[PDB]
Design an enzyme around this catalytic site. Structure first.
Site, short mmCIF file in Angstrom:
data_model
loop_
_atom_site.label_atom_id
_atom_site.label_comp_id
_atom_site.label_asym_id
_atom_site.label_seq_id
_atom_site.Cartn_x
_atom_site.Cartn_y
_atom_site.Cartn_z
CG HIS A 1 -11.61 2.99 -4.35
ND1 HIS A 1 -10.65 3.13 -5.19
CD2 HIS A 1 -10.86 2.79 -3.25
CE1 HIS A 1 -9.44 3.11 -4.93
NE2 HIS A 1 -9.53 2.78 -3.46
CE1 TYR B 1 -3.93 2.35 0.14
CE2 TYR B 1 -2.52 3.35 1.94
CZ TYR B 1 -3.53 3.30 0.95
OH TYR B 1 -4.59 4.61 1.22
CB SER C 1 -6.19 2.82 -3.55
OG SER C 1 -6.58 4.33 -3.49
CE1 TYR C 2 1.81 5.93 -1.88
CE2 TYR C 2 0.29 7.79 -2.14
CZ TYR C 2 1.68 7.33 -2.17
OH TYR C 2 2.62 8.29 -2.28
CG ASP D 1 -12.93 4.19 -7.94
OD1 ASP D 1 -13.23 5.22 -7.11
OD2 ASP D 1 -11.98 3.44 -7.90
C1 LIG Z 1 -6.66 5.02 -2.49
N1 LIG Z 1 -6.51 4.50 -1.11
C2 LIG Z 1 -7.13 6.58 -2.52
C3 LIG Z 1 -5.98 6.90 -3.78
C4 LIG Z 1 -4.81 7.64 -2.72
C5 LIG Z 1 -4.42 7.28 -1.56
C6 LIG Z 1 -5.62 8.04 -1.42
N2 LIG Z 1 -6.84 7.28 -1.48
C7 LIG Z 1 -7.95 7.27 -0.55
O1 LIG Z 1 -9.10 6.72 -0.81
C8 LIG Z 1 -8.12 8.41 0.41
N3 LIG Z 1 -9.11 9.37 0.21
C9 LIG Z 1 -7.78 7.82 1.83
C10 LIG Z 1 -7.61 8.98 3.02
C11 LIG Z 1 -7.52 8.24 4.41
C12 LIG Z 1 -5.95 7.73 4.26
C13 LIG Z 1 -6.06 6.23 3.24
O2 LIG Z 1 -4.64 5.96 3.52
C14 LIG Z 1 -7.13 5.30 3.78
C15 LIG Z 1 -8.38 6.14 3.69
O3 LIG Z 1 -9.43 5.21 4.16
C16 LIG Z 1 -8.57 7.20 4.92
C17 LIG Z 1 -8.84 6.57 2.35
C18 LIG Z 1 -6.34 7.16 1.91
#
Ligand SMILES: *[C@H](N)[C@@H]1C[C@@H]2C[C@@H]2N1C(=O)[C@@H](N)[C@@]12C[C@@H]3C[C@@](O)(C[C@@](O)(C3)C1)C2
Ligand SMILES: *[C@@H]1O[C@H](CO)[C@@H](O[C@@H]2O[C@H](CO)[C@@H](O)[C@H](O)[C@H]2NC(C)=O)[C@H](O)[C@H]1NC(C)=O
Ligand SMILES: *[C@@H]1O[C@H](CO)[C@@H](O[C@@H]2O[C@H](CO)[C@@H](O)[C@H](O)[C@H]2NC(C)=O)[C@H](O)[C@H]1NC(C)=O
Ligand SMILES: *[C@@H]1O[C@H](CO)[C@@H](O[C@@H]2O[C@H](CO)[C@@H](O)[C@H](O)[C@H]2NC(C)=O)[C@H](O)[C@H]1NC(C)=O
Ligand SMILES: *[C@@H]1O[C@H](CO)[C@@H](O[C@@H]2O[C@H](CO)[C@@H](O)[C@H](O)[C@H]2NC(C)=O)[C@H](O)[C@H]1NC(C)=O
Ligand SMILES: *[C@@H]1O[C@H](CO)[C@@H](O[C@@H]2O[C@H](CO)[C@@H](O)[C@H](O)[C@H]2NC(C)=O)[C@H](O)[C@H]1NC(C)=O
Ligand SMILES: *[C@@H]1O[C@H](CO)[C@@H](O[C@@H]2O[C@H](CO)[C@@H](O)[C@H](O)[C@H]2NC(C)=O)[C@H](O)[C@H]1NC(C)=O
Ligand SMILES: *[C@@H]1O[C@H](CO)[C@@H](O[C@@H]2O[C@H](CO)[C@@H](O)[C@H](O)[C@H]2NC(C)=O)[C@H](O)[C@H]1NC(C)=O
Ligand SMILES: *[C@@H]1O[C@H](CO)[C@@H](O[C@@H]2O[C@H](CO)[C@@H](O)[C@H](O)[C@H]2NC(C)=O)[C@H](O)[C@H]1NC(C)=O
Ligand SMILES: *[C@@H]1O[C@H](CO)[C@@H](O[C@@H]2O[C@H](CO)[C@@H](O)[C@H](O)[C@H]2NC(C)=O)[C@H](O)[C@H]1NC(C)=O
Ligand SMILES: *[C@H](N)[C@@H]1C[C@@H]2C[C@@H]2N1C(=O)[C@@H](N)[C@@]12C[C@@H]3C[C@@](O)(C[C@@](O)(C3)C1)C2
Ligand SMILES: *[C@@H]1O[C@H](CO)[C@@H](O)[C@H](O)[C@H]1NC(C)=O
Ligand SMILES: *[C@@H]1O[C@H](CO)[C@@H](O)[C@H](O)[C@H]1NC(C)=O
Ligand SMILES: *[C@@H]1O[C@H](CO)[C@@H](O)[C@H](O)[C@H]1NC(C)=O
Lengths: 728, 728
Positions: free
Chosen positions: B702, B509, B592-593, B670
């Protein structure tokens, strides 16, 4: 050693067919582009001069996409900043260049983002469409006259077609028809007010932060259609009145009673125009013949000159009612119509008598009428040797119908069995274009005695290159099922040995009036598959296929997704019976209608096919456009044909895909067969737990034709077939 | 010999973790749903009574989604017609059951399509949001008072968050905050007027003829952000005849000078509220402490009571500034802040004093403050055994900071190294929830002498089941890079033999402040891959990872797609040299990340990885939302960080994908990481002639979490990994 024809050979266009594309400017002369120079050729002697030097537009500041010379030879229209829209439509910028004074025109220029422009047929008047309205210039350097004020983006279209008329009715973007000497300008107006929009994302270059939504008025099956009106304006009145009157010609009462289409516009004389109309239920069509009335300023269409065409077994025409070819005086015309045996032949009509006289007959069909002179009518047919997949030029003596001469049949029988033709202005000369089974051959002829004057292009260069390649062969033949001949073709690997068992790929299209078995020479993906991978690539024309009469063509009336699907499966069984096919390695593929049929076959549970590829398939008839779909299926209502619309979907067969390997491919910007259709297939397969392979192509349309996407899709498909067939 | 944990076991939830989800209703009792019955439990003795029988609503006529009992126990809110929106948001219908009457309330009902509803903290007042406006009921059967009149779909949001505040700021749809005794209702108003819309197609059921376009106000990086206002209304002085007066609390001048966010709302007393505001450049935040003025009717925030929190090395807070915990009198508070060395610890503030006093210290971090009494503060930290991936409950004596007691560390050290906790209303009791490395264990305790009262759920049933299964094990250890330890975990196949060579999948991740190496027990895809396929599944926490101080976490400040990518490669390299890893069979995957990092790794040219899978990846930071992206990346302007935005895309690495096998997967609906992101990756790979595998999921968001899509994606990924590793 001779190399094979490789995937890279196909993808990099290593072996190119040479063309000879000419444009007739008179009865005796044509233009031709040779190393950027536009040359004028004299047909009789073959000598040429430079019409326009390649250096003329070096300082233009823009790359020139195309040109159009005025019929009087005084002006040239320069097309640049070309931006493609649908299959035929595009926008461009335009400049006009005065040839006699060697000057560009900088005064009162045609606007940027012009949708269509055409010269008048005589002289140098211009009509163009800009922001959905029609404009006329009497002189290239003078202000334009606006003709219409109702143009509205996505709503009202004046002198251009909307999406469905462009694709399914006119096969053209224009909707402007100059009278023969340019006095009158006729035009259609389309009203898409209540036509629903197809909407899809367009991603564009990486720099674009938010995707664009493309929105296009597009009637799906059973939906609200565009409405149409027809008008004629007198362009000679334009400089005398501030606002010239567009005179409407209304459709016949038999059309106005419900939904209908305008399907043909043909000028007969300076003062007589024919309009064909078609009911939304496309088995009834009406031709009006309308004359200008000097005292009333109106256009009147006598009922004694109205001609009705109907079909009891299917729809009217191959894809629409056929076009009329008027005699010079405009008092009679010729038209291809289906005879009492169901074969399409030339019929001769007087404008005011309802019964026509067939001038050809037999168990073969006329493909098109190509030219009409005082003494002869020239036409293309598949009569020769009773091969429905061949094409030859014939002429028939108008004073004695028993006297028919084939003009192309015996020119080179072994090399040339598929011809098209381009006649000079009054049919004094013609170019013949042979496209197979040998290499393409272009020749020029004079009509007085049909003498062959010279060879224009013989593809000798390609012939030499292909000597060093192990090329596949092609077999074109028939099988007899239920007393009926059905034609097929096979692309056979080099050194083909009928004692061995080859994998086979069935290349399918199979839409109504289509033909996949013919005498045309092609360098394509199948060439590679046969030459390099030793795969037989076969195609079969079953029920619903064209050019063999209505008994065959109309067999799938109101029943798409039935017989034409069953006949592909049967073809594969018949090929297996021939003894040289590995029955463990039979695959199927197709694009659009072929994608639909491939998917229906793969979902059939036949057990015949190991794997298949569907590219941009139709999946459910309610998702495709009204004009094409309803022609064959009628309306998706309980009172008409809804039951069959609902049981002819790919989605209902999802469970049977468990037995096959499936690859599903679609361009995301397909305006024609919407990405929606494959999105619903994939969802149905997911819902029943079927694994499959997928590929989307970002921002590609129906053609998946960008240079990089084309290379990518065929590469991806090649890996899939080879894996399926256990080929290293 | 016994079975393994199969893909079907994972997908069909054969082995289920039991929970014990309670809801405290006082300092002494909690509610618990057992067999649809809601029971009340006495904490001290463990006796129970039925609160609500499961058959009370047998004639209700709707499936009940959830229940919410009023704080005084007199009413129950019944939630039905649930329709999910985003991660937290949804709409629903609501009925209210009056427990005194034993009857549903039939008058003045809560409207259908209600967006949010909440009881007051005491008694039985209700606040709800419907059509973006706020309403208050003083009694459940009485007419509502409309608080706001400005609500407008996609434009003005009163008492609910817009897309980006929901996902990235409050992790909730609600933006309503009741005062502790219910006198005041505080709320935020969001204005999205100039926020651009993300637009994407939704295909729906096969019956839908035209796809629908979904449109959501969503600010991508550097785009126009929503603006925010804050208000407080007195619900005790509402009138039937006069519209309600809301009092605005404006942001401090230091925030008003440019773009900013509201990031925390916490009531301190009945008449004192604290708000935290954050600059759009998220390295500067300010807390206001605002008192009600009973004579002017204003809320006044004294400058002397402002508290500034800033960062020189990164952004403020883990994902946002932390919440304060106010003392009884509301004159001081405890808050987690980064100390001078960059480790997060508890600081003790007086409301009118600039400097705070750290009450904890060390090279470990406080995860969260869980309860505050006059005597003790209760918190979770990773202090124990210096393991950043473990979690334990501690209390610190507020009168003497040397007296810190670990409450969970020694309860069951072999089974339980990761705890969360739930305290009763005034912290007389707490439930501990252990989540690994053994099976989850739920226990109840009293605070007075930290007695362990009873075992609530020990998962003995699941334990009995798993004895019959060859389960994998989990190794948690570290590697040393530059005198810094970085932790990893490995899911190891049963009967693991270090003399044998196993293929390895790197599960990544690696987003800022994330942690993938921990002591939590999971049953997931990795469990199957290790148990059945004998694949080691490793994860590694490198630079940018959380819970180990700012030196590590802030390492990727303004530089996403650098060190956290490089560190995964370095980790895999080290793993590949361990004598039990096959260096020819190393894969990588993430969501995602994780999909971003997978893709960046596969495009690095490292040669370490044979294949990888990216699910719903970010591809370019300009495509992701403002609040998240800018926290780490600043603004995409030439003056700020545009160069790094442009250098950190997946698309720029497309050429390097020539040497790997890649599978790219994305749901078409998504709303979070837009399909656009993968559409741009595919187009870039096509443009450089790289073959790859793809899968879209029609109408999935998503989560790709519908029953059938979830089963399909993991099935597809399993085939891909097995083929990559040559597994039958
Ligand atoms: C994929 N996880 C998505 C793309 C980039 C990293 C950010 N993403 C999210 O969905 C964010 N909105 C969140 C914000 C916080 C911290 C996270 O690491 C996990 C999350 O549930 C809560 C979603 C990234
Ligand atoms: C078509 O577009 C071109 C390019 O925009 C126009 O050319 C000029 O554009 C510049 C700005 O790039 C402006 O200063 C003027 O508006 C234009 N000047 C001249 C001398 O043309 C061009 O005008 C457009 N063509 C028509 C027919 O409107
Ligand atoms: C094109 O067709 C539409 C009807 O679909 C006409 O627009 C109007 O439609 C509205 C509601 O559909 C009616 O209230 C009006 O009576 C229609 N007429 C007008 C003048 O607004 C529209 O007029 C047609 N446009 C043209 C140029 O023919
Ligand atoms: C183009 O054709 C039109 C229509 O036939 C010709 O215009 C007519 O000419 C006749 C006889 O010459 C006149 O009696 C009418 O007044 C004309 N009618 C109209 C509507 O104009 C015209 O002569 C032709 N144009 C050219 C250049 O030959
Ligand atoms: C054109 O097609 C329609 C639709 O098939 C024919 O409509 C007839 O009316 C209804 C169905 O719409 C049926 O009850 C009749 O049996 C249809 N006639 C058939 C199937 O022959 C209509 O007859 C067709 N027109 C022509 C000239 O054949
Ligand atoms: C748990 O047990 C105690 C009894 O030991 C319950 O308290 C009693 O409640 C009943 C009826 O509600 C009364 O008759 C007694 O006088 C109460 N006794 C005491 C000592 O308070 C309590 O209600 C039980 N709690 C639950 C949730 O069932
Ligand atoms: C929520 O929606 C339902 C269904 O539209 C409403 O149902 C009522 O009962 C029937 C159908 O079940 C309808 O004919 C009535 O018009 C509805 N009215 C009443 C007064 O019950 C229901 O009312 C809606 N609930 C609210 C609070 O608006
Ligand atoms: C919500 O925000 C918008 C601004 O985005 C406010 O509307 C006006 O915005 C335009 C530009 O879009 C400006 O010309 C005006 O000055 C703004 N407001 C006024 C009153 O003129 C809008 O008022 C806001 N709405 C609410 C309820 O706060
Ligand atoms: C809840 O807290 C509020 C706010 O402090 C209390 O209301 C205030 O207290 C007294 C009531 O006797 C008045 O002097 C103030 O005017 C009230 N303030 C407001 C804004 O109304 C209220 O008493 C508390 N509730 C309980 C049950 O103690
Ligand atoms: C918060 O970060 C910003 C930008 O990263 C810093 O702003 C400084 O001022 C201007 C405006 O962007 C820049 O030209 C400077 O380079 C920035 N200074 C730096 C990066 O040192 C601001 O200093 C930061 N705040 C804190 C407390 O460090
Ligand atoms: C696929 N070719 C697509 C789906 C179904 C069969 C119809 N399709 C079309 O694109 C039609 N618009 C045309 C109409 C005529 C006849 C065709 O067979 C070939 C075409 O070029 C001209 C396109 C189908
Ligand atoms: C061709 O030659 C003839 C003379 O033989 C000449 O009159 C004519 O202009 C020439 N045409 C071209 C196009 O060069
Ligand atoms: C021209 O006449 C038509 C038809 O009457 C009218 O709709 C249009 O508005 C007129 N244009 C001008 C400029 O008068
Ligand atoms: C309250 O405000 C709304 C919106 O401005 C208005 O429509 C309504 O009449 C007001 N009610 C009273 C009692 O003033």
């Amino acid at each position: 050693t001779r190399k094979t024809y490789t995937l890279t050979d196909y993808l990099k266009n290593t072996y190119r067919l040479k063309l000879y594309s000419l444009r007739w400017i008179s009865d005796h002369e044509y233009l031709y582009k040779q190393e950027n120079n536009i040359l004028v050729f004299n047909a009789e002697y073959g000598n040429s001069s430079v019409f326009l030097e390649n250096s003329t537009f070096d300082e233009f500041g823009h790359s020139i996409n195309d040109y159009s010379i005025s019929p009087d030879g005084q002006f040239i229209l320069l097309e640049y900043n070309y931006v493609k829209q649908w299959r035929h439509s595009y926008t461009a910028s335009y400049d006009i260049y005065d040839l006699n004074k060697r000057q560009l025109i900088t005064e009162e220029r045609i606007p940027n983002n012009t949708q269509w422009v055409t010269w008048s047929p005589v002289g140098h008047k211009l009509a163009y469409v800009w922001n959905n309205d029609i404009y006329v210039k009497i002189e290239p350097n003078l202000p334009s006259y606006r003709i219409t004020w109702t143009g509205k983006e996505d709503i009202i279209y004046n002198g251009i077609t909307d999406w469905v008329y462009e694709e399914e009715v006119f096969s053209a973007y224009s909707a402007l028809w100059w009278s023969p000497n340019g006095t009158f300008l006729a035009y259609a107006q389309f009203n898409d007010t209540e036509v629903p929009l197809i909407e899809y994302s367009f991603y564009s270059d990486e720099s674009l932060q938010y995707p664009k939504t493309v929105r296009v008025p597009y009637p799906k099956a059973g939906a609200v259609n565009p409405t149409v009106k027809f008008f004629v304006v007198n362009t000679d009145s334009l400089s005398s009145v501030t606002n010239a009157t567009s005179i409407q010609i209304t459709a016949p009462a038999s059309m106005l009673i419900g939904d209908h289409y305008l399907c043909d516009v043909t000028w007969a004389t300076q003062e007589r125009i024919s309009l064909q109309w078609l009911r939304r239920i496309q088995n009834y069509s009406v031709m009006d013949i309308c004359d200008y009335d000097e005292s009333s300023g109106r256009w009147n269409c006598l009922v004694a000159r109205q001609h009705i065409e109907m079909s009891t077994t299917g729809w009217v025409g191959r894809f629409r009612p056929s076009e009329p070819h008027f005699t010079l005086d405009g008092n009679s015309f010729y038209k291809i119509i289906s005879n009492e045996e169901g074969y399409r032949h030339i019929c001769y009509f007087q404008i005011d008598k309802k019964d026509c006289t067939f001038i050809t007959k037999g168990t073969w069909e006329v493909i098109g009428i190509e030219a009409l002179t005082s003494d002869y009518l020239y036409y293309i047919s598949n009569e020769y040797k009773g091969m429905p997949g061949g094409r030859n030029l014939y002429k028939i003596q108008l004073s004695d119908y028993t006297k028919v001469t084939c003009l192309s049949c015996e020119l080179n029988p072994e090399r040339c069995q598929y011809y098209s033709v381009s006649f000079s202005k009054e049919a004094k000369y013609y170019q013949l274009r042979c496209s197979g089974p040998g290499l393409p051959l272009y020749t020029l002829h004079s009509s007085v005695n049909d003498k062959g004057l010279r060879v224009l292009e013989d593809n000798s260069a390609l012939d030499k290159m292909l000597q060093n390649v192990q090329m596949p062969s092609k077999k074109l033949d028939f099988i007899i099922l239920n007393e009926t001949k059905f034609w097929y073709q096979m692309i056979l690997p080099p050194h083909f040995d009928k004692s061995k068992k080859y994998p086979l790929l069935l290349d399918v299209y199979a839409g109504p009036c289509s033909q996949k078995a013919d005498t045309v020479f092609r360098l394509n993906w199948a060439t590679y598959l046969a030459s390099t991978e030793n795969i037989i690539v076969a195609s079969f024309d079953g029920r619903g296929s064209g050019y063999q009469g209505d008994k065959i063509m109309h067999a799938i009336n109101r029943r798409l997704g039935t017989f034409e699907v069953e006949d592909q499966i049967e073809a594969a069984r018949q090929f297996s019976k021939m003894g040289f096919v590995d029955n463990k390695r039979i695959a199927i593929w197709g694009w659009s209608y072929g994608g639909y049929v491939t998917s229906m076959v793969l979902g059939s549970g036949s057990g015949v096919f190991k794997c298949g590829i569907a590219v941009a398939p139709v999946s459910r008839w309610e998702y495709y456009d009204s004009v094409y779909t309803e022609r064959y299926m009628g309306l998706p209502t309980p009172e008409d044909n809804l039951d069959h619309y609902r049981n002819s979907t790919v989605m209902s067969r999802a469970e049977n895909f468990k037995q096959v390997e499936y690859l599903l491919i679609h361009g995301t910007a397909d305006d024609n067969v919407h990405f929606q259709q494959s999105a619903q297939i994939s969802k149905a397969l997911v819902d029943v737990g079927v694994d499959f392979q997928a590929m989307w192509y970002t921002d590609e349309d129906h053609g998946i034709a960008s240079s990089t996407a084309h290379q990518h899709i065929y590469t991806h498909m090649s890996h899939f077939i080879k894996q399926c067939f256990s080929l290293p």
